[PDB]
């Protein structure tokens, strides 16, 4: 059961944008599968994370489907990823030959042979390593400060649905004509203690 009330209790959510479905709706319908995709980007590229968008991250690193279902939750994390002397452990693919199909991974770490002359292990002149590392220094501006992103994607296929938000229960009222809903059994009447 996916309680999204814990979402709002979290960080200010610099960006909290839900596509197609509304935030008040996703706690009602019941999906069959959820994918949570987490990463760290720059503030400048947070707008790049959107269906049908263009940019370095949109093209080569993380491409949303044109009919993406779900939503994106981004929040600043300058408390964590900011380190004095620059935090050089967060990489991103600067060089690529093509555009990724939606929800694809490109972990290949090779020299980008973008010139006529091949490299084959020689990183000289026209021989580039496509993974550039962010600075994420504490003094960087809002655009270049690190921002964490989680994209939630929902699948509601013909398979039985097993992920969706919680259902509330009221008190129990007896010896009074009321309207009851017991696990989906809906009726009206007087509820009494029994010995069945």
């Amino acid at each position, epitope marked *: 059961v996916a309680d999204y009330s814990v979402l709002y209790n979290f960080a200010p959510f610099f960006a909290f944008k839900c596509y197609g479905v509304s935030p008040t709706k996703l706690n009602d319908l019941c999906f069959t599968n959820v994918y949570a995709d987490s990463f760290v980007i720059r503030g400048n590229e947070v707008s790049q994370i959107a269906p049908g968008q263009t940019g370095n991250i949109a093209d080569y690193n993380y491409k949303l489907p044109d009919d993406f279902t779900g939503c994106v939750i981004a929040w600043n994390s300058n*408390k964590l990823d900011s380190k004095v002397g620059g935090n050089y452990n967060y990489l991103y693919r600067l060089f690529r030959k093509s555009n990724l199909k939606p929800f694809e991974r490109d972990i290949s770490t090779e020299i980008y042979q973008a010139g006529n002359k091949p490299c084959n292990g020689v990183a000289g002149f026209n021989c580039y390593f496509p993974l550039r590392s962010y600075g994420f220094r504490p*003094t960087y501006g809002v655009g270049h400060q690190p921002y964490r992103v989680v994209v939630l994607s929902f699948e509601l296929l013909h398979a039985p649905a097993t992920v969706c938000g919680p259902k509330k229960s009221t008190n129990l009222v007896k010896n009074k004509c009321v309207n009851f809903n017991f696990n989906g059994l809906t009726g009206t009447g007087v509820l009494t203690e029994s010995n069945k």
Partner: antibody, heavy 128, light 109 residues
């Protein structure tokens, strides 16, 4: 108020390797923004920081001495081990371990970063 | 590497008046990465000011500091004989983290 203490063999022979124990109390090595810094001070000369370890087991070494310097942390024991090899008589100095923290306010604007008050330190001398 | 420079080498001023020191940087970097530290003879250094523009914890209002780019300065107004200590300016901008060269404050006679 945090207690910082340093220990290790004060007499080490030259071209040898020494290990330094740093014990801290009042804080733990599982908090964001917390680091442990190892600093050497020659007698009468300017201060000179050497090494840093973050809470996430990520360590910074001085580019002038990163070859033979290691700093490791143990959150469970509130323990720090600094191993430094190939000492020479000139390495007769004072060794300190201290805290590193930074300040953020409602947007993580980074109102600077600082060191906490340093420990007692150890006068480590090298002589054959 | 960014080099720092304390000025003057040794400052000689009596307690009571204003004492001012300068710290200049060879290269440029943001203000918040410089820190003013205090240490006594045979004593552990103590954090004087962090960010070089905001007081540290428990610092009396006499201590102050201001500067920009590659030129900062620090000032102590009501200094006592026990307050006479060695002050260092250290950069948090990039590794290695290097302090000042040390300036001694002494009572005039």
């Amino acid at each position: 108020q945090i207690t910082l203490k340093e220990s290790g063999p004060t007499l080490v022979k030259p071209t040898q390797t020494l290990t330094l124990t740093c014990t801290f109390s009042g804080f733990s090595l599982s908090t964001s923004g917390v680091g442990v810094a190892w600093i050497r001070q020659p007698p009468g000369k300017a201060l000179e920081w050497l090494a840093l370890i973050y809470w996430d087991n990520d360590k910074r070494s001085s580019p002038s001495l990163n070859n033979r310097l290691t700093i490791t942390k143990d959150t469970s024991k509130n323990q720090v081990v600094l191993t430094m090899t190939n000492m020479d008589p000139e390495d007769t100095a004072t060794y300190y371990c201290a805290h590193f923290f930074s300040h953020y306010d409602s947007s993580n604007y980074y109102y600077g970063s600082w060191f906490d008050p340093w420990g007692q330190g150890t006068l480590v001398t090298v002589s054959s | 590497e960014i080099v720092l420079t304390q000025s003057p080498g040794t400052l000689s001023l009596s307690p009571g008046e204003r004492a001012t020191l300068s710290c200049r940087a060879s290269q440029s970097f943001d203000s918040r990465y410089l820190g003013w530290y205090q240490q006594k003879s045979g004593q552990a250094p103590r954090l004087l000011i962090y960010g070089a523009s905001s007081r540290a914890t428990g610092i009396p209002d006499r201590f102050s500091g201001s500067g920009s780019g590659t030129d900062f300065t620090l000032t102590i107004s009501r200094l006592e004989p026990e307050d006479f200590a060695v002050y260092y300016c250290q950069q948090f901008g990039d590794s290695p983290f290097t302090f000042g060269q040390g300036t001694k404050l002494e009572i005039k006679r």
